[PDB]
Structure 1
């Protein structure tokens, strides 16, 4: 209906969000520099549009960053640097993805990404570097 109904377009294609270099602390206080990327899709378009003011992609990316950093650091804290490098099945990444998709308390946890209109489909680490002194 003209002048009464407006339309907002939300892309259902998978969006890719990459994280710049950042430092993580392992169990032996060995500092690591981790590059990782996440792929996410919108599950409930109305819920996603409500949760992020105006349905802006950057607003959702900010929340995704905030949660993903916490879960990834909490997972790395219990691990050895050798355990991280020798990991080939992506067990920690899969666990991080499961934590992001299903939070901790058909009930939906408020801290889960399902409470928002976001579904995380894949989490991967691109490169693991050392501080220049250690290298």
Structure 2
């Protein structure tokens, strides 16, 4: 009754959101891309011991960094039309598989990712005016 306490951890499919951030393609064109990631807790012991207290902010920072890195590495390859034509089709699945898979796994931290989507693609002001 008085030597110990325990911590209650949510298990529902949590949702992370962000704001716009720029990018670039090989045609020197630049876009605006927004997205969101579904993440689930895989193994609870490793999660609690690693993240240090189990409040969302640090997990948010970890996933934010890693997602930005992997996506920005991927879109830098394909061409301007290839974004708009099929941005779901192999981008989302490939980046999901690469991000989910030892250390550097993003699962080693104890997090399972469900799926990744892209929400909107705009263009800068000057190019918009020209078109």
Q: Shorter chain as normaliser: what TM range?
A: over 0.9
Q: Secondary structure at the match of 1:90?
A: helix
1:126 aligns with 2:125: no
Deviation at 1:18, TM superposition (A): 1.2
Report how far residue 60 of structure 1 moved: 0.3
Q: Please, which runs of 5 or more residues in structure 2 have no aligned partner?
A: none
Cα shift at 1:90: 2.5
Q: CA deviation at 1:3?
A: 2.1
- The answer to whether the 8 Å contact 2:87/2:118 transfers is no
CA distance in 2, matches of 1:89, 1:22: 18
Checking the alignment, whether the CA contact within 8 Å between 2:44 and 2:110 is kept in structure 1 is yes
Residue segments in structure 1 that go unaligned for 5+ positions in a row: 102-108
What is the deviation of 1:73?
Answer: 0.4
What's the C-alpha RMSD, in Å, of the aligned pairs?
Answer: 1.1
- Cα deviation code 1:25-51 (max 9, x no counterpart): 112121111010100000011111112
User: 2:89, 2:46 → 1: CA distance?
Assistant: 30
More strand by share: 1
Compute the displacement of 1:133 (Å): 1.2
